[PDB]
């Protein structure tokens, strides 16, 4: 609202909060990002290093869909299925292990970060990591690849 | 200019919260009277009548 803005409190002060020595002129330093290498060089180098120059290869017809690969972590791994699944597996005595499919829930690669509760799991995914594999093996379980 | 931001959007949860607060406050005689409504003769301010 215009009621609460600084302009209302600024009426009557000739200057309008912009100084008498240096006025409020149009474009004292140039428009936009001008002088990035000449008279704004200090600011550009101090606050945006690496701005100027080229690096890396050019990929012309990039399609993000080819590289689409969402990831999940082992601490979140048990949240894909319902709690009743996990508790039933926990108090089960036959040794049967529930099957968790991350592709069904929309994940492609499993990365092993969190601690895993001690019960067998059949994790089926598209890609695995070495540490996630070893975590699943240590907790007791199976890793299954799907396409 | 005609392309001023005339409209605003509010969260659905906030709208429901406001509706709930208004409904709850409509049941208190002090607030209804302070709104100016003359209800000193009303038998019961959560006034309910049959479907007839």
């Amino acid at each position: 609202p215009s009621r609460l803005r600084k302009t209302r409190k600024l009426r009557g002060h000739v200057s309008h909060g912009h100084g008498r020595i240096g006025k409020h002129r149009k474009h004292p330093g140039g428009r936009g990002n001008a002088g990035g290498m000449h008279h704004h060089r200090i600011n550009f180098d101090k606050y945006h290093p690496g701005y100027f120059g080229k690096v890396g290869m050019r990929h012309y017809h990039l399609k993000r869909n080819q590289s689409f690969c969402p990831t999940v972590n082992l601490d979140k791994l048990w949240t894909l299925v319902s709690e009743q699944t996990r508790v039933n597996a926990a108090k089960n005595k036959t040794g049967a292990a529930p099957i968790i499919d991350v592709v069904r829930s929309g994940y492609y690669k499993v990365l092993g970060k969190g601690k895993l509760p001690k019960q067998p799991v059949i994790v089926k995914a598209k890609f695995f990591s070495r540490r996630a594999e070893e975590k699943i093996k240590g907790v007791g379980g199976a890793c299954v690849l799907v396409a | 200019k005609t392309w001023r931001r005339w409209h605003r959007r509010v969260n659905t949860t906030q709208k429901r919260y406001a509706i709930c607060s208004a409904l709850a406050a409509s049941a208190l005689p002090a607030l209804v009277m302070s709104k100016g409504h003359r209800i000193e003769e009303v038998p019961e301010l959560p006034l309910v009548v049959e479907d007839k």
């Binding site: - | 949860t13 429901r16 919260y17 709930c20």
Partner: protein, 52 residues
């Protein structure tokens, strides 16, 4: 109460909605001061004026 759900029952007509939680339940400040268990753990009220 089907529209907005109870405290222990979600709203049936809305997808997933429940009444907003209370920040404070017992809003009777008069009681909250005038209850024995809080009055016990209080120092004596100094109420004599000491003018210049």
């Amino acid at each position: 109460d089907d529209l907005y759900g109870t405290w222990r029952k979600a709203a049936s007509l809305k997808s997933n909605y429940n009444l907003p939680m209370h920040k404070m339940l017992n809003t009777d400040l008069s009681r909250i001061l005038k209850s024995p268990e809080i009055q016990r753990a209080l120092r004596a009220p100094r109420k004599k004026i000491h003018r210049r």
